[model samples]
Target: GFKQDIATIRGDLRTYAQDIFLAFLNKYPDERRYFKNYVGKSDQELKSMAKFGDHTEKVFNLMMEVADRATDCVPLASDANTLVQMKQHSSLTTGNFEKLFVALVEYMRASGQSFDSQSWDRFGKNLVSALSSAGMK
Candidate 1:
């Protein structure tokens, strides 16, 4: 049977989401370069990839939003019923997370941009570290 304390499970989930977000960032280095250009794009283009000249910043921003959204779920992992409740609630919440991320990917692809898997991996590791530290406190 899976055995982990509520805090541990909570920490793990948060870290997982964060790490995924970061990994998305690492995979597409050009996205970062695009952001560095410092030219702002329209919100629709930013959200749906209508016509983004430089997609790096826009993609990063979307992933950051995903990570931030995951952060809100930390409360569900607190106290007892950690794993049980998380699993149950995650069915709904994780779907939302997946949808948001998938939309981001679709948006980028539609706009002639690429997603970065490396960034997603790096983000996962960073999230593990950050969430673990947060749990410890």
Candidate 2:
């Protein structure tokens, strides 16, 4: 069932990816500084960039993996660790990660995707736990 759900939505991944970033920018305007290179670019321009699409696919796939593990009652610490690495590599603060999580939820609702609250809860909890374990404030 999980695999099927993922498969069914494969075609929409790019759209959802763009929506997530747009949602983030709209909800957390200050965070836009991190994307300084895209300054003055239109939303469509930012979304159409190869880097944006690549990053979006990576993030979306990771979220799907987290959801699958959550559904199976598996620990998500490993996946969360991977996420934390991404955050660190991107020089993002824990607060940014928090905002990103919120943006992701907003994206799901705005895109009319089925929001699995329980899975998201698990994903959030695991991420926080991972961050804490790594000495992040």
Q: Among these predicted structures, which one has the highest TM-score?
A: 2
lDDT of each: 0.36, 0.66
Question: Residue 127, candidate 2: how far off, in angstroms?
Answer: 1.7
Model 2 worst lDDT window (10 residues):
1-10
Give the C-alpha miss distance for residue 127 in model 1, angstroms.
Answer: 8.2
TM-score of model 1 relative to the true fold? 0.24
The candidate that achieves the highest lDDT relative to the unseen native structure? 2
Error of 2 at 36 (Å): 2.8
Instruction: Give candidate 2's whole-model lDDT.
Output: 0.66
Give the runs in model 1 whose Cα sits over 4 Å from its true position: 1-92, 117-137
Per-residue accuracy of model 2 over 44-106 as CA lDDT, tens digit each: 887778887887777777766665666453436676567666643457556777787687666
**Candidate 2 to native Cα RMSD, angstroms:** 3.1
* Residue 72 error, candidate 1, Å: 22
- Clashes counted in candidate 2 amount to 0
The local lDDT score (0 to 100) that residue 25 gets in candidate 2 is: 80
